[PDB]
Write a protein that binds this ligand. Structure first.
Ligand SMILES: Cc1ncc(C[n+]2csc(CCOP(=O)(O)OP(=O)(O)O)c2C)c(N)n1
Ligand SMILES: Cc1ncc(C[n+]2csc(CCOP(=O)(O)OP(=O)(O)O)c2C)c(N)n1
Ligand SMILES: Cc1ncc(C[n+]2csc(CCOP(=O)(O)OP(=O)(O)O)c2C)c(N)n1
Ligand SMILES: [Mg+2]
Ligand SMILES: [Mg+2]
Ligand SMILES: [Mg+2]
Lengths: 549, 548, 549
């Protein structure tokens, strides 16, 4: 059986540790999908639509480290681009492979199906270059190994996604086989010496862990530096779970005036803040109100540290933090005697109407060290950041891209990447409507994801930035949807919870559904949301609206 | 009270004839949506997601002439771009407007939500320029009139979509008000004389009507020319319904070896073919096998005619066709003796298992002159092109872009644009799962769309180009979905038809459902499809696979 | 004195070893040029126009390793882009820095001078992304270190050029200071083991050295492998000088039917060819006639080797060649008893009309181990590739980009990068007309470049692909131009040579001009060119013209 270009790609994807890749068929990729099916270290997973395909691969990469999605030219890839730009924003090496016109059509002027109807077939690549770290087109088998290895090696080095298109008559063409793997003292001393003087010369220091720290591979080194300093540690909201909440120095999330108790003063009252790989965007800074920077910040990024008025280039954040931790003095003033303060809401009477605080209390009680909680944009961001996490629990947030509906397909991909964990999904009713059909794929693969669907009858987070008729949604019977997707062949279970007692019974049933997803539709009033959402929403709306010049 | 940049856009959109625009809210567009709401000539319609928002605008433009969709930066617009590229492919002036960063963030290096996380806000405009005829960004109210009028005037002139983004703090900023409207004889003589010579020198001439003729506004002039020539007239598959099927010269669709009976010889056996605004792509030419071109073809395009070895530029197709029809000789040889042959499927025994031919027969019987039949990519293309159309019936096909799932939001937008017509949607089960949630918006607006969902358990069209496990889909209870979307406040109705008797009884219940959509889930075997799909699919596949 | 963004860039450019950078002033870069003037490890050099500016930096990088050019927005940068795409094509890390609009104009709709007159100021960056490996815009000083270090570190790693624009009011803004520096066994064993089996299983092997081998840093390792194998070694034309011509295995250039004697048979008659970092384009393959590839080629590239039907990724060409050389058996059949054969033209009678072969004989006799010979596109490519090189002599060719006129500004930049060497420039009269004014800069800096200007009254190389009235040029008094550029303040010398005796006397005078350039205008008939030009020109023209499908 002749070895082909598509096999070359399949074998490299398996080699970088994918166990699955995601696809939607179209004639320009069918031979490629057949070549990928020959690799039996991976399962080929089919998605309902390409936007869902792309966010399933994004969710898979959060657990696995990388992922791949394969789509057809133009009508598949342009939807997958929203999710690919999402992977770029969230520092995940997703490889999007699109099927593409037969190479013999290049140079002809032939107009081809799925294109704009002009002689141009390069617009899709051109568009992809704006949202990836590498983008290549294979029209000849002899070029395929260099292009495949370039796109995979660059994506994995940068932790950013990349794009590959393969002419449809070349996916099955003969190719060579893959071999090998796609899977500075003075500078470091100067940077470490400056960071040690920054700590030593201050009376108090607090660490603030940012949401690029996973992409830097530096989470364990952050803990070593926290152990050595004994300082208060806080996380930015989008870094929820990236630092252990049972560490004796952890004091919660820093998010300006919506911080955990004590955390705003820990960061803003300290003589120096050590910021590890942050994303200071308008939402994270609460409309530019909460943004530690400048001479009293040691800004540590994946290949540079800026401290004491100097940017030290050429140093790896991991080696830096390890050396700094081995030599620093202790600065424990912002931690001593303090603790991380989490909500302590008393249980509601079981028959009272369900409210947000009761629902969040029951969800937080479900978390284990083995839980992965995917939380959608909406008030679920604020309920998730408020949860006290058992050590080992993972929270996945998409706070820089913020595409509502990401969470459904992302929970499906994560559940396939990490089947040993307990997957829990918190998604609002508005977000659910964009990508709901990927629950039918959860059902198809008997994945036991527990989904809390928060039915507050519209886009409550927008109701709290700026209200209007556009925040209303058509209501669905969300719980009844599960039987519709099972269609007599599936173990999906849909339950409704209108009280704390109904929610607790629904949760018991969900935990007992071992071979399919359970959706629990939790009914809340439209204005029953976290206080933090309202305080943040005000500040961020005022920032968006601020008047020209 | 103070007139704003978003009211200037709203008023221009109303001025070009929109009665609706489509939107998905996000913080970058809310002020803009509040300004659009002030125009009471339009209704603002909310969509489940942005791919569906864009394709509802595309289906609305097919009936209305134009459309607009409003989305938020990046997370909204990048999915709407698939639909915008689809409006370019299908020659429809959809205007996509996206909300965008506050103008005071430009020049700062601020990182913003919904972006790539870099200091770049211009990637979205840059991407949009590849799929539109005009693309502008407003960051200052002083510029907004020239940029709104350039995108709308260019889109309407070119019959192609356009892109506008408006900084979120500028949509509510004061603006001037809109006034005025956004809504060669020697060359024509030379072209008409060469075309007259082309016809007079030939004994058998046939017309082939192409799917860019509606973008040219030349459908009535094509009828005038067919009346003068008396010749056979055929339509390309994607031009279904663009020429009237009761015309005495109509001889059905030309589609190479899957043509209506006699139509392949009408075109391929003629001494000349008059080709009106065709798209000869790989699917239309049946893998490059069926492609009339060259010295024996008069190729008539929007602004140019190529005939007799010369390309005549600067002539409007409408004026050309009217002058040619007024002077031409008659050439009726290709019509003599012939007729349009359409399927004559006998009615099945009512309790026999449903098959595709029976389902197609009953859907064909439902069509009227006031029907719009939206037909999805899949075997529904072949069942639609085979339908005998009453004069005036409209069929909508998306055969150049061909994005499965387009039909659901496109039928929703066409139902809002043309509420006086009877809307019928044929959609396959695989396609329905990409965009199904827009049926909930049909229910929200009480639109009486009758939807035939063909449940043959997978992607049968693909099963016929090249089969594999990727053609299987997770089955749904499609009928039972209607009550889920009603959620106690809607008039959607879901029915199942497993026999011709059950299908006839479901169609009569669907016709009686006047205030909400009815989905009839028709069960067919995977391999029970038209013969034309099988024949077309193998040619088309062989062309895709041809070796380096 | 406050440290600024422009200083940050100046100090990083000095740190990567530039001794000069090239500039043309415009109001959008004047404050930046003032910040660069503060670094006294570099000289700021002014160019006549931006295309010349960009090719002076390209020539400088060939000697130095890297280079920088600074230009004004749009009217400067778009000309510099031709030279930047040239640097990409020739694998040289040139950094182009453009001055750019004031940051406060972004977001205003202001129309600005030097732009297209629309509200768009991003088109220049967008265009630059197609011809560089990194492209960034600085509009805020706090972003400047990351963007500067990203563009320099990426350019130096990739050996490709990069682009940076800096808002004009930010070049002088305060900035932090620069610290630190911008300056796999199993895979390697598998690749080496396969390459050793490739050699061992064959009776004869020949090495073919390609013009990407400098960018790979692998020239010394190629010599070690040639020493170990004892095989015939040949160079592709564009690799002239990248392998030592006095090595006992060297047998000249392989260039199909225009190869050195014996070299075509060495490569095409061998059982296996080891190809080191080649560029097989239409000119190198002589119109696709001479292109060793496939199962009998070991293709060695900077990070991959393809041999024995496998592409081994993840291995550095230098480590690979060193390990291969340490273990290979000898395969000397294609070298034994052979020698590199070079032209042996007898000296012309001194008073006979000068002809090409006599001119090339005198130029070849001028070369020393310390010579850098820059040779322009035209018949000078074929005269240069025919020269026998003393060990250490460098030849610079621009055979992939092939922009006529490159050679003038490239010889000026090289002469500044490497003033310890003897610089010689061979440029035809047509090419000279595109960029002649950079000889006035050679004069301004007293650079003793000897220029042979071949005046054959038009574009003789095109006359031999396809003749027409477009191959004629307006003749100039090239030798008289030198006094015009000196304008009473310069040591440029212009001489004419119409015979071999006049050329020899002119050369003596040139060698004696120690403080300025000498141009010797050599008069040749239009059809007096190398035989190789005519044979190559035919083949490459036939390839260009070959008929649609
Ligand atoms: C693709 C996309 N379109 C629009 C938005 C704007 N958006 C941000 S939050 C949100 C509503 C989320 O509503 P829901 O999921 O019901 O969450 P709630 O706040 O009610 O819990 C919207 C429309 C977005 N973020 N992404
Ligand atoms: C967005 C998109 N992705 C993938 C494709 C490839 N595609 C062409 S037809 C088809 C299947 C259509 O299946 P169905 O709607 O069930 O129609 P059938 O042929 O079964 O009646 C596919 C997947 C496409 N055209 N568009
Ligand atoms: C910028 C640019 N424009 C046009 C060309 C096409 N070109 C290739 S060689 C050449 C003529 C070179 O003439 P000359 O320098 O007189 O060299 P000769 O062959 O006569 O020695 C031309 C015009 C090119 N290579 N670069
Ligand atoms: Mg909600
Ligand atoms: Mg189907
Ligand atoms: Mg010349």
């Amino acid at each position: 059986m002749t070895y082909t270009v598509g096999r070359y790609l399949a074998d490299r994807l398996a080699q970088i540790g994918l166990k699955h890749h995601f696809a939607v068929a179209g004639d320009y990729n069918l031979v490629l999908l057949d070549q990928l099916l020959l690799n039996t270290d991976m399962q080929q997973i089919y998605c309902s639509n390409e936007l869902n395909c792309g966010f399933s691969a994004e969710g898979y990469a959060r657990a696995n480290g990388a992922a791949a999605a394969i789509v057809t030219f133009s009508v598949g890839a342009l939807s997958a681009f929203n999710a690919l730009g999402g992977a770029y924003a969230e520092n995940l090496p997703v490889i999007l492979i699109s099927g593409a016109p037969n190479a013999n059509d290049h140079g002809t002027g032939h107009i081809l199906h799925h294109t704009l109807g002009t002689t141009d077939y390069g617009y899709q690549l051109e568009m992809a270059r704006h949202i990836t770290c590498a983008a290549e087109s294979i029209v000849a088998a002899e070029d395929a190994p260099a292009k495949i290895d370039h796109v995979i090696r660059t994506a994995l080095r940068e932790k950013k996604p990349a794009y590959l298109e393969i002419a449809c008559n070349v996916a099955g063409a003969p190719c060579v086989r893959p071999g090998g793997i796609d899977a500075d003292e003075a500078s470091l001393k100067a940077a470490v010496d400056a960071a040690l003087a920054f700590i030593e010369q201050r009376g108090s220091v607090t660490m603030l862990v940012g949401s690029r720290i996973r992409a830097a591979g530096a989470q364990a080194q952050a803990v070593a530096l926290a152990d050595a300093l004994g300082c208060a540690v806080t996380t930015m909201a989008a870094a929820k779970s990236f630092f252990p909440e049972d560490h004796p120095g952890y004091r919660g999330h820093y998010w300006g005036e919506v911080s955990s108790p004590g955390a705003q003063q820990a960061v803003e009252g300290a003589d120096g803040v050590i910021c590890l790989a942050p994303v200071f965007n308008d939402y994270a800074t609460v409309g530019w109100s909460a943004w530690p920077k400048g001479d009293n910040v040691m800004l540590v990024e994946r290949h540079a540290v800026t401290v004491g008025g100097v940017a030290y280039a050429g140093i790896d954040m991991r080696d830096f933090l390890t050396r700094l931790a081995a030599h620093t003095v202790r600065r424990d003033a912002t931690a001593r005697g303090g603790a991380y303060v989490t909500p302590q809401t008393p249980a509601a009477a079981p028959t009272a109407p369900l409210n947000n605080a009761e629902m969040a209390r029951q969800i937080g009680a479900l978390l284990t060290p083995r839980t992965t909680l995917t939380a959608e944009t909406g008030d679920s961001w604020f309920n998730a950041v408020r949860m006290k996490l058992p050590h080992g629990a993972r929270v996945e947030l998409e706070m820089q891209w913020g595409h509502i509906g990401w969470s459904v397909p992302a929970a499906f991909g994560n559940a396939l990447a990490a089947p040993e964990r307990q997957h829990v999904l918190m998604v609002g009713d508005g977000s659910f409507q964009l990508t709901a059909q990927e629950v039918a794929q959860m059902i198809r693969h008997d994945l036991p994801v527990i989904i809390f669907l928060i039915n507050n009858h519209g886009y409550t987070i927008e109701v709290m930035i700026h209200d209007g008729p556009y925040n209303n949604v058509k209501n669905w019977d969300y719980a009844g949807l599960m039987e519709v997707f099972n269609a007599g062949e599936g173990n999906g279970l849909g339950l409704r919870a209108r009280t704390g007692g109904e929610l607790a019974a629904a949760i018991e049933q969900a935990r007992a559904n071992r071979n399919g997803p359970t959706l629990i539709e939790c009914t809340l009033d439209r204005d029953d949301c976290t206080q933090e959402l309202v305080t943040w929403g005000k500040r961020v709306a005022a920032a968006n609206a601020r008047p020209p010049r």
